[PDB]
Amino acid sequence: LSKMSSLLERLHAKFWSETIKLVRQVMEKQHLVSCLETLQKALKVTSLPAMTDRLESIARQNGLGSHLSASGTECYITSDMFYVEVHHGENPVSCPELVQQLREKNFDEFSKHLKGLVNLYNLPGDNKLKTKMYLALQSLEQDLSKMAIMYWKATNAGPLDKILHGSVGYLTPRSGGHLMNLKYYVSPSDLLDDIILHENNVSRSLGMNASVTIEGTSAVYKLPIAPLIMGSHPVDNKWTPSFNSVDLPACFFLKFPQPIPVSRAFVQKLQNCTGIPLFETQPTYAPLYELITQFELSKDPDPIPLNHNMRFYAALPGQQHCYFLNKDAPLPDGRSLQGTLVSKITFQHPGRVPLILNLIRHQVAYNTLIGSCVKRTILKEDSPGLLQFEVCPLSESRFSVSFQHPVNDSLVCVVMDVQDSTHVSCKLYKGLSDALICTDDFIAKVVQRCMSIPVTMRAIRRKAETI
């Protein structure tokens, strides 16, 4: 449309040397040109100074200072982040991640790495403390490394045990802009794909993660600037006490990529274990089952909201299931299970990080058991089957799945309590005059092998119907 009048004015131009002479006279006499250049870096052909130009464009894009010394060597330069492609330290590592991205045509991941390296050193201090602040992170990282190695000294456990129940976790050290990732949990479903063997080339995203970092806060805290574990209790870790240290206006963080919904009693348990307040302002509490459903539905997004009204449907092989997750059922205190989304847990010194993680592992395990109901499969109002189930919270870390007896007509309620990360105990609750359905250890076996409600309910139904 506008191109037609553009071609008409172009026909008027046919009816430019004077324009070049005008540009020359102005030469004898900003943002737009560089913006067009940064759009057009996509269309540059592969060549050595052109790739230097596109890397300079990445530098201008993420706010960093480019400097070439040749067509080979180009430096990205800011107050501490200084590295080349061919402050206060060497250029440490020829890291294969950045080189592997740049040897291919993967410049956006290079941009993400420079974004992460900006967000590491964007701390508010006058730059001197910044160095010391980064040093504190280094000390923390070293301590964290030792603890995982201490666990590898303790037992020669596989990576799965290192994830599920060990100290720290599967620990990927930092490399470029990617900060240090602890994998504290991987579910029995998310372990499997479409039956994964878990050998030490395990994926970064294969589970639930938490990245450790430093961040400037509004308060002042005392953090170590030295590797705090010089002496190690041979099966534990043991920390020499503080001061060294200095009172940086910052704190260590465990940032989760996807915010975890946690209950109120979790908030008090973690503020007891840490000592530092978690929610600086008090947030707006919500029922946990809303947050669990928003978490599980916002895993795989679609533009249509499900409009569930807490009545989820499950299409299974030899069965069809319905679930009522039943928020606002009152606890013994008289209130529903109220929780909020946590994303950043602040700790001061690294000895807290196993205990903190055990708490989060507990919480994440509980969410997976309530995560298995939240599905998008709509087998709406099918007259065959639709075994109508209910989930209610009797307490923190306990819940109950209530459902019709497969033989008789009284209710049967299976109460599940999540003791630890991989241990959930189960009790069948039955009328005094009913049929034998299952033993509790069978329910514990199916739960710990699958970590999903509907699979255990089908196991209950099938082992009832064989008898």
Binding site: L192, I195, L316, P317, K445, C450, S452, P454, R458
Partner: peptide, 20 residues
Amino acid sequence: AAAAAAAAAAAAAAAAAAAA
């Protein structure tokens, strides 16, 4: 919709194998 989720189907197979 009206389809067993593939991941759920795999978990069902694993559960059936356990305890014969």
